[PDB]
């Protein structure tokens, strides 16, 4: 585990000692690797920057440059945390707590998302030690990648107004059913802006010279549309692909460079990496020993290493 | 019972007339709504004079 401890610094509200008991299996973001550390850098008051608190995109950027840690065992003197970034060498598969409305799967990669849900705030309050605690919500990673694209684009609509007030909310989610509504309260600009720029600048490099030949086959896409099932379902209705349909540009130097093969490389370099440069890295994977295929809300799932 | 000045006013035959009849054949396809890949080769002929 390469054991790391966090002590109980000063005093105890006597029911709130039991509040630390039911947080077993949650995640602490501690911005270090320590053998002992105070509880002051733990809470959300440390997540608050100079003067201002981060938004749910800034908390992504706040959870960027800190280190997650697993609650292992809860003492009245200390709390032993295992440093996820290094000390994931656990054949004992140190256990986590699922605090999420989604019943997951077996075999999901699990990445951490700030509490942004309408009813799972994960707000526990300490008044003897005046601190506020937001636990991250562990979620499956495609469902995690369906969230971060919404919240930045919702902040993309925070730059430009123009349109009438009835906008698509980006606030109805879909997992097999299960209509989810999240919170849209505040959108800090710099958390939107720096997230928007890497969405711009990576999509710059992901276009290359041999990429341009693929753009010719855009009318070839709709030729498969009215003659099969798979393509017509692949072609989305709310897509620009159905909108843009309504050429080599020769410039041929040398022609032994494999121009089409080189196109799919650098496209995958930056447009292939769009979930992980915006959000947190997944290192938690669902692995139950008993053959249980799903893990209930509130359960203690065994946790294995990087996916 | 048709008298004189009725068929006397058949004088107006010089203005409009018709020469002969002609079979019109202009076929069709299935609609937007049934036109699929197998039905794209389908034609339906319609004849009329």
From Swiss-Prot, chain B:
It is found in: Virion; Host nucleus. Disulfide bonds: none annotated. Homomultimer. Makes the hexons and eleven out of twelve pentons. Interacts with triplex proteins 1/TRX1 and 2/TRX2; adjacent capsomers are linked together in groups of three by triplexes, heterotrimeric complexes composed of one molecule of TRX1 and two molecules of TRX2. Interacts with scaffold protein; this interaction allows efficient MCP transport to the host nucleus. Interacts with capsid vertex component 2/CVC2. Interacts with the small capsomere-interacting protein/SCP. Belongs to the herpesviridae major capsid protein family. Self-assembles to form an icosahedral capsid with a T=16 symmetry, about 200 nm in diameter, and consisting of 150 hexons and 12 pentons (total of 162 capsomers). Hexons form the edges and faces of the capsid and are each composed of six MCP molecules. In contrast, one penton is found at each of the 12 vertices. Eleven of the pentons are MCP pentamers, while the last vertex is occupied by the portal complex. This is Major capsid protein. The gene is MCP. The chain holds residues 885 to 933 of 1374 of the full protein.
